[PDB]
Ligand binder design. Structure first.
Ligand SMILES: NC(=O)C1=CN([C@@H]2O[C@H](COP(=O)(O)OP(=O)(O)OC[C@H]3O[C@@H](n4cnc5c(N)ncnc54)[C@H](OP(=O)(O)O)[C@@H]3O)[C@@H](O)[C@H]2O)C=CC1
Ligand code: SF4
Ligand code: SF4
Ligand SMILES: [Zn+2]
Lengths: 126, 111, 114, 95, 48, 287, 176, 95, 370, 208
């Protein structure tokens, strides 16, 4: 009913329940997932994925497997903006690294200049 | 009638005068409400239409098949319930304009 | 920037509720060690109770302190009844080591944890 | 059609056998290390390489909709045999 | 194979002794039948 | 060393630790708790057994999915035991019954058994062979059990000289013989000095000695902290239990100290006294 | 459209009320229930004599997890990982290597029979129909190690029989 | 079946429902297996020259949801009209 | 198996808290970390006694979001198996009520009937119980030839056997005197406490999802859903019995008017193509391959649907980001909604009547847990 | 279009449009959105203050009965300042229509405990308190349903991973079942399946 409210930071790491080692040791990475180059499509772009650093994955010697003692290793969080990404990573407690976004720079390609006269641009095959 | 199809509903014996004094109380408690709202308009409209249905009906089954809400006493039950929300809508000020907006990046779904 | 608080206005009622909850947990323990037939003296149980209170001793948001009051009160209800069996009350303790130390050297011989 | 390890047991179709300083040999103690003793490498060489009298041919593998899908392979290698990746068997050409 | 009984008592096996050399006069097992009789015995067909 | 023998990552429950341990006996008490701590460590334990597989069935699932392995042996054939310890890192000798059977005396178990298995283990070439004995088992009289343990100590020190001879005091736990024997009595009153030690400290000492390096040769003896009168201990047993010939001579012999050889202080573990763990284990009295 | 139960009244004719009171005092329809149960007593019991008369089944039962192979030929699988992708329990585990023949092959092909929920997605997802839900359902495994199958256990399981699996697939290659 | 008439009459007397007629032990009308193979017909596609996927593309016809609000009006209609009351079925009502 | 904590004045009550959640399995999070077609058997087996109506509800959820109508032969076959599942679940509810109350043998008679129904499931899909078999986008791998005669013979024999069950129980005096007096349901409480299905059919008001909102061709089969009279456990039992009888009538009309249409949709980007064209096409192999790796893309939006499982309003609420994975499913369970009102059903009775209340609402706790 | 595609009924579309416009114009105090889907099931998007007045208005008023309450789930969405979504679902007995009342909420500020007006929301509020952390203000009994007692962490969040942080096992040392930090037996490969190339052109959001 429009009460006393203070406008401060949050400390939700006490309430999310995950213990201290998995809170303060692993470091998040907020990145835009790069384009898988064997395809050419940037629909898989336009999101900010938060992931964690990988840790040890040994060989289970009975079947030849990959077991691990890592519950946080297989997360990914899809975000819409870097601002809410950093706000969430500072809300929930753990340390983090933020990279920036890289785009294809707009070029100026033209078939008519690919069939030039006195420039060295010449397709030599078509 | 005798012991209608519902279970937890003891039948009535004088439906008409009971329903009429219920709807007069509906119109009065609506009379408490300020005129400038639209809730007064729409509830006055629908309740006086139903009252005009009942004034042309001294029967029971023709009253149940001109007006919906089968069979009979659920109409009285929801009339009491609408009187209850009328009493609650003296409070709660719903005609007053909007409380503060969402931050406008929220309801856009496909994320 | 208007937020409805849970229970408290400032930290005064937060401190009052959390010391009330600590008083209840102090007078609640010997009933549990008499009822569930535990294997641990009263001193060690009270020391880990005050350890768990002292672990989160630096949170100043009153909403969060009220919500931890609600958490501790739910666990106090479910331990003052006979619902939570011997396994959960022993699960609060850590006697199944896990002796994993916090050196650098012993963390180096069992590596990949800097 | 199997080999035999110098330790004294049967190797698989993959050369995965153990050294002397292991312990999965000692969890093999008492119960038999199974191995399918009918391999797949040597069963190709017992097949007759068919000599089809056309240029570019087809392969299904013994039965329509029971086997692998249609692959049309080329036989233009004048001394090498065209190999189906599914079937694993060879062909030639004779005009 | 009989037809005079109901569906479930059409076909029944009777095992012999020492089919592996294991003295199976007693303690008869499942999977002691070869697989074409396993197609026939479970009533997946009518042809022996 | 080949791969998948080195440790990997964290500890236990398919986290592969370093050791590969072959445990003899391991049907009864102390072998069961030691197999439990090695399953907590997450190793591979070769346990052979001669008895019925129901007993190793009840102590079976303490290891992880297919980590521990079960096999067979006897007290007569060297070849089956050599087959059992073909491929192993370490081997521990924990065998011995506290009464003569019809087929085996205290003769030839403590006498024949460690010589044969230590012989075939030295012929196999393993490390850190850990052999149990009792404290104060000298050459002297009043117990065939104690003099045969003295002979066995002489055997294990004589052949395969870098064997770790280990000895605890009278050890108590959930399925003890002497403490539950004092619980399940009837009576007589005498005097004897004695120290007990709770079983998890002994087996944590054994696992720390078996994974920590270069402690071979030096025989160890496990010392409880209390070290007081047997009669006060028996009155303590009747007090906590609320109710007011070979084994009785082996408990009325004595328990004296041999302080020259070290204990748990060169190993770094708490030794738990009688009060806490005894109130823990002394259930099942009246009501 | 509705048809509701229990709308009558107990009658006021003396004959009807004395028939109901005769039912009350004389245990009548209880005895009629005894008569119904004795009428099912004198039937013949529909039990199958289990180890000699095994139960009826389908042409398309989902059982044994046996691989197949080509007519007078090599292994049918490719290691194309479609079964591992569709496996909802994620019990399929594949590691592939090609061999000296040039054609692509495997190294490791493990099914976790503990985890396998026996759907049919790997039966219907294999483009060459290499892995097939087998005919028989008799596993009954003592240890926990033995319920983890290797490629060689699957191939010996598919070479102890194929003529059964070939008969089933040749019976119903038209529906799926 | 496979019983005499005396115990048959005792069955039909202990429950007067003619138990010999239908008994839930099937002998004859077990469906005769090894059926002939089917030829499955294909429905409203494989129709050549008209099957345009631009036409029947119901996936791409998924409209975004239409929004009506923000952050003497003859109105106040119900969402759907009220449901007509049922009747007893003629097929054996009560009472 | 449930936990119950009852605080009671003696051979009576004061309060009764059903502690449940013991059979919790992480189903919603596990569906969140998978695709649609991979995570279909979760909705097959969260409820486990009913086994094809749950699949029908999840298939209708994905079809109603995806805007694809199945071909009509698939719809009529789906109707047939929905009525088989309804018959099976109601007869198991009756027989486990009878076995928990005592009453040893009709349990076994009707489980002989249910063994024949598992034989029908075997001949259709192949597995014993958990027929996946209902893809979103139409039914997969239609029934083999030589089945409808078996279903018709079963329909006659089961009509006679359900009449003989009504002979056995049902005007048995002491089972009636066991369950008449107990467990009234006020219609006001029947609407507030969120009861569904057989509770709404028994406790007064006329309400059938099948008759009101046809989620499939049910508007073209002729039957009548039974109504209760006094909101009562014997009355609710008779309601279950006549729902079984009308399921038999729907099986009769469905076997009368089956069309020879088609198995799956002709939409090869949603349902996989059949095997012959898969072996000889190109687009069939491409659609097969990418459909079984990624799963088909699904437009964004939040849908809700609900059908009549034999316990009641089985509701499934899909939330889909535009992707091949469901972003969040959720299940409204009639068993959970029924068990919510245990205080207002057992406010004035004793513990044997409490076991009767647990009987008269078909709890299974695979579904009551979500 | 005419086969293989479920048609839509624009009669019900116009009816639900007019009804939602009616409700939105007669309760201006708490309404932000009334959106209609293609398949005609209404969604009403609401500020977290008027929960009790909107539910009391939507239980009664005789232009819309909606006596029937169904599920409540608060599906967790990051990249929103107020994260969680309370989804009431309301069904009319007389009218055969479904309205999804979506009110938004944050991590800490409570919504106003709908158990007082709908008795079917008791275990719903208790369950969503256990699984999420959405507190309900002036509710009688708040306990843990569908979790273990000693467990905590609110596991249907997105920050809680798929495998939990605990792993039970029996041991004979302490003669009981104890919890250790988690040790998997296989990795649980979370595959990459987000393929590019924009399968739905009609849902292209406007970029920055
Ligand atoms: N006070 C104490 O308890 C102390 C005990 N110890 C030693 O600890 C060990 C374990 O103690 P305890 O509780 O008695 O457990 P056990 O007596 O059960 O352990 C002895 C093991 O040897 C096996 N065994 C028995 N008879 C023979 C035989 N004739 N040949 C070969 N193996 C045999 C036993 O059964 P199985 O055949 O089924 O494997 C068992 O596995 C003993 O060796 C004991 O000397 C040492 C110091 C103090
Ligand atoms: S789908 Fe078939 S060919 Fe592909 S990996 Fe699996 S078994 Fe092999
Ligand atoms: S039947 Fe299902 S769970 Fe089993 S291996 Fe095949 S796809 Fe995986
Ligand atoms: Zn080929």
């Amino acid at each position: 009913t429009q009460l006393i409210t203070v406008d401060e930071k949050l400390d939700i790491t006490t309430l999310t329940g995950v213990p201290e080692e998995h809170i303060k040791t692993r470091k998040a990475r907020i990145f835009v997932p790069a384009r898988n180059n064997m395809q050419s499509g940037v629909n898989n772009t336009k999101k900010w994925k938060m992931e964690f650093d990988t840790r040890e994955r040994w060989e289970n010697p009975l079947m030849g497997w990959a077991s691990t003692a890592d519950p946080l290793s297989n997360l990914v969080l899809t975000f819409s903006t870097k601002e809410d990404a950093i706000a969430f990573a500072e809300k929930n407690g753990w340390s983090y690294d933020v990279e920036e976004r890289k785009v294809p720079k707009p070029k100026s390609k033209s078939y008519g200049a690919n069939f030039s006269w006195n420039k060295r641009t010449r397709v030599s095959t078509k | 009638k005798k012991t209608t199809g519902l279970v937890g509903l003891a039948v009535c014996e004088t439906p008409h005068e009971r329903l009429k004094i219920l709807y007069t109380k509906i119109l009065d408690v609506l009379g408490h409400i300020p005129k400038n709202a639209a809730y007064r308009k729409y509830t006055e409209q629908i309740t006086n239409e139903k009252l005009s249905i009942v004034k042309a009906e001294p029967d029971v089954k023709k009253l149940e098949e001109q007006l919906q809400g089968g069979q009979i006493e659920e109409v009285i039950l929801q009339a009491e319930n609408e009187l209850s929300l009328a009493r609650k809508m003296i409070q709660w000020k719903p005609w007053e304009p909007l409380v503060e907006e969402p931050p406008a990046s929220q309801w856009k779904w496909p994320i | 920037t208007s937020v409805k608080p849970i229970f408290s206005r400032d930290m005064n009622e937060a401190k009052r509720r959390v010391r009330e909850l600590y008083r209840a947990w102090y007078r609640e323990v010997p009933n549990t060690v008499h009822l569930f037939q535990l294997d641990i003296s009263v001193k060690q149980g009270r020391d880990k109770v005050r350890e768990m209170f002292k672990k989160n001793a630096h949170v100043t948001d009153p909403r969060v302190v009220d919500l931890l009051v609600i958490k501790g009160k739910m666990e106090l209800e479910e331990t003052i009844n006979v619902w939570k069996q011997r396994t959960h009350v022993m699960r609060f303790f850590h006697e199944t080591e896990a002796p994993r130390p916090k050196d650098f050297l012993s963390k180096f011989y069992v590596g990949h944890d800097p | 059609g199997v080999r035999t390890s110098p330790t004294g047991e049967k190797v698989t179709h993959t050369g995965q056998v153990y050294d002397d300083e292991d312990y999965r040999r000692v969890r093999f103690v008492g119960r038999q290390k199974e191995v399918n003793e009918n391999f797949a490498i040597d069963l190709i060489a017992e097949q007759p390489v068919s000599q089809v009298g056309s240029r570019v041919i087809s392969c299904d593998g013994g039965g329509g909709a029971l086997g692998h899908p249609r692959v049309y392979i080329n036989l233009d290698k004048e001394t090498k045999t065209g190999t189906c990746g599914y079937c694993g068997l060879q062909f030639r050409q004779q005009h | 194979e009989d037809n005079k009984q109901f569906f479930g008592r059409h076909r029944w096996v009777i095992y012999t002794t020492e089919m592996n050399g294991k003295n199976t006069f007693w303690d008869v097992d499942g999977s002691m039948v070869p697989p074409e009789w396993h197609r026939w015995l479970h009533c997946m067909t009518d042809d022996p | 060393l080949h791969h998948a023998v080195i440790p990997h990552g964290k500890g236990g429950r398919s986290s592969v630790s370093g050791i590969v341990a072959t445990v003899f006996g391991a049907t009864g008490f102390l072998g069961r708790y030691l197999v439990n701590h090695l399953g907590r460590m997450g190793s591979q334990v070769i346990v052979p057994y001669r008895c019925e597989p129901y007993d190793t069935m009840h102590l079976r699932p303490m290891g992880d999915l297919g980590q521990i392995i079960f096999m067979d042996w006897n007290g007569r054939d060297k070849d089956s035991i050599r087959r059992a310890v073909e491929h192993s890192n370490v081997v521990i000798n924990l065998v011995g019954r506290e009464w003569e059977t019809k087929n085996f005396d205290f003769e030839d178990v403590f006498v024949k058994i460690p010589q044969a298995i230590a012989q075939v283990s030295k012929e196999a070439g393993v490390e850190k062979f850990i052999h149990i004995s009792h404290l104060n088992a000298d050459i002297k009289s009043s117990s065939k059990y104690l003099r045969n343990k003295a002979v066995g100590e002489k055997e294990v020190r004589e052949t395969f000289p870098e064997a770790t001879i280990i000895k605890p005091a009278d050890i108590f736990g959930r399925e003890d013989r002497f403490l539950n024997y004092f619980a399940n009595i009837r009576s007589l009153g005498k005097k004897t000095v004695k120290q007990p030690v709770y079983i998890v400290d002994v087996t944590k000492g054994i696992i720390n000695a078996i994974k920590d390096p270069d402690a071979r040769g030096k025989t160890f003896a496990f010392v409880g902290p209390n070290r007081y009168l047997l009669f006060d201990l028996v009155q303590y047993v009747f007090a906590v239990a609320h109710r007011p010939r070979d084994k009785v001579e082996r408990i009325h012999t004595t328990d004296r100290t041999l302080p020259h050889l070290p204990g748990l202080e060169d190993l770094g573990v708490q030794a738990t006294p009688l009060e806490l763990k005894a109130i823990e284990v002394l259930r099942r009295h009246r009501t | 459209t509705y048809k509701y139960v229990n709308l009558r009244e107990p009658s006021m004719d003396m004959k009807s009320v004395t028939d109901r009171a005769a039912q009350t005092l004389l245990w009548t329809e209880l005895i009629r229930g005894l008569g119904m149960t004795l009428s099912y007593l004198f039937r013949e019991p529909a039990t199958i004599n289990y180890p000699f008369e095994k139960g009826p089944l389908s042409p398309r039962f989902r059982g044994e997890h046996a691989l197949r192979r080509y007519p007078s030929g090599e292994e049918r699988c490719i290691a194309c990982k479609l079964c591992e992708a569709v496996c909802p329990a994620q019990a399929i585990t594949i590691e592939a290597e090609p061999r000296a023949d040039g054609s692509r092959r495997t190294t490791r092909y493990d099914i976790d029979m503990t985890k396998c929920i026996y759907c049919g997605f790997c039966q219907e997802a294999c483009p060459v129909d290499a892995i097939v839900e087998g005919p028989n359902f008799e596993f009954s495994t003592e240890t926990h190690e033995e319920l983890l199958y290797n490629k060689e256990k699957l191939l010996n399981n598919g070479d102890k029989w194929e003529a059964e699996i070939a008969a089933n697939i040749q019976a119903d290659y038209l529906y799926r | 079946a496979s019983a005499t008439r005396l115990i048959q009459g005792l069955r039909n007397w202990a429950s007067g429902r003619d138990l010999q007629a239908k008994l839930q032990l099937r002998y004859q009308e077990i469906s005769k297996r090894t059926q002939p193979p089917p030829k499955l017909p294909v429905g409203p596609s494989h129709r050549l020259s008209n099957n345009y996927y631009c036409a029947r593309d119901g996936r791409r016809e998924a409209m975004p949801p239409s929004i009506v609000m923000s952050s003497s009006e003859k109105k106040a209609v119900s969402p759907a009209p009220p449901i007509k009351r049922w009747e007893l079925s003629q097929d054996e009502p009560y009472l | 198996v449930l936990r119950l904590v009852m605080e009671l004045s003696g051979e009576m009550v004061r309060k009764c808290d059903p502690h449940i959640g013991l059979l919790h399995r992480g189903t919603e999070k596990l569906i969140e970390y998978k695709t649609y077609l991979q995570a279909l058997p979760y909705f097959d087996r969260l409820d486990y006694v009913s086994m094809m109506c749950n699949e029908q509800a999840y298939s209708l959820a994905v079809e109603k979001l995806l805007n694809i109508q199945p071909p009509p032969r698939a719809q009529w076959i789906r109707v047939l198996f929905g009525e088989i599942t309804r018959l099976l679940n109601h007869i198991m509810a009756v027989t486990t009520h009878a076995l928990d109350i005592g009453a040893m043998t009709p349990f076994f008679w009707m489980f002989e009937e249910r063994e024949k129904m598992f034989e029908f499931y075997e001949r259709v899909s192949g597995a014993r119980m958990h027929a996946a078999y209902v893809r979103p986008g139409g039914v997969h791998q239609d029934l083999p030839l030589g089945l409808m005669d078996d279903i018709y013979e079963f329909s006659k024999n089961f009509s006679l056997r359900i009449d003989e069950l009504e002979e056995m129980l049902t005007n048995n005096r002491i089972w009636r005197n066991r369950t008449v007096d107990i467990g009234v349901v006020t219609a006001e409480d029947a609407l507030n406490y969120g009861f569904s299905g057989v509770m709404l059919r028994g406790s007064g008001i006329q309400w059938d999802l099948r008759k009101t909102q046809p989620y499939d061709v049910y508007d073209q089969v002729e039957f009548d859903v039974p109504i209760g009279s006094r909101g009562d456990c014997y009355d609710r039992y008779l309601c279950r019995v006549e729902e079984m009888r009308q399921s038999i009538r729907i099986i009769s009309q469905c076997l009368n008017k089956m069309p020879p249409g088609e198995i799956k949709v002709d939409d090869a980007k949603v349902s996989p193509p059949k095997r012959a064209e898969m072996k000889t096409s190109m687009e069939s192999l491409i659609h097969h391959f990418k459909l079984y790796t990624e799963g088909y893309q699904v437009p964004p939006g939040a849908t809700y649907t609900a059908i009549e499982a034999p316990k009641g309003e089985f509701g499934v609420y899909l939330v889909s980001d535009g992707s091949s994975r469901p972003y969040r499913c959720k299940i409204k369970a009639p068993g959970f909604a029924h068990l919510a009102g245990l205080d207002k059903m057992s406010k004035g009775h004793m513990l044997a009547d409490v076991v009767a209340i647990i009987g008269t609402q078909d709890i299974v706790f695979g579904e009551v847990d979500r | 279009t005419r086969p293989t595609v479920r048609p839509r009924n624009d009669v019900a579309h116009k009816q639900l449009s007019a009804f939602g416009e009616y409700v939105a114009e007669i309760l201006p105090k708490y309404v932000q959105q009334v959106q209609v889907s293609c398949f005609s099931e209404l969604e009403i998007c609401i500020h977290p203050d008027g929960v009790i007045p909107v539910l009391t208005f939507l239980r009664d008023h005789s232009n819309a009965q909606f006596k029937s309450l169904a599920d409540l789930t608060a599906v967790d969405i990051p990249t929103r300042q107020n994260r969680f979504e309370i989804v009431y679902n309301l069904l009319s007995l007389r009218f055969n229509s479904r309205i999804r009342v979506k009110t938004y909420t944050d991590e800490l500020t409570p919504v106003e405990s709908s158990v007082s007006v709908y008795k079917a929301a008791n275990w719903y509020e208790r369950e969503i308190w256990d699984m999420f952390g959405v507190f309900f203000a002036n509710h009688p009994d708040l306990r843990r349903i569908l979790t273990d007692y000693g467990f905590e962490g609110h596991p249907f969040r997105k920050d809680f991973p798929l495998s939990g942080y605990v792993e039970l096992r029996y041991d004979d040392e302490v003669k009981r079942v104890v919890a250790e930090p988690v040790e998997l037996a296989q990795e649980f490969r979370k595959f990459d399946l987000n393929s590019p190339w924009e399968a739905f052109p009609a849902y292209r959001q406007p970029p920055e």
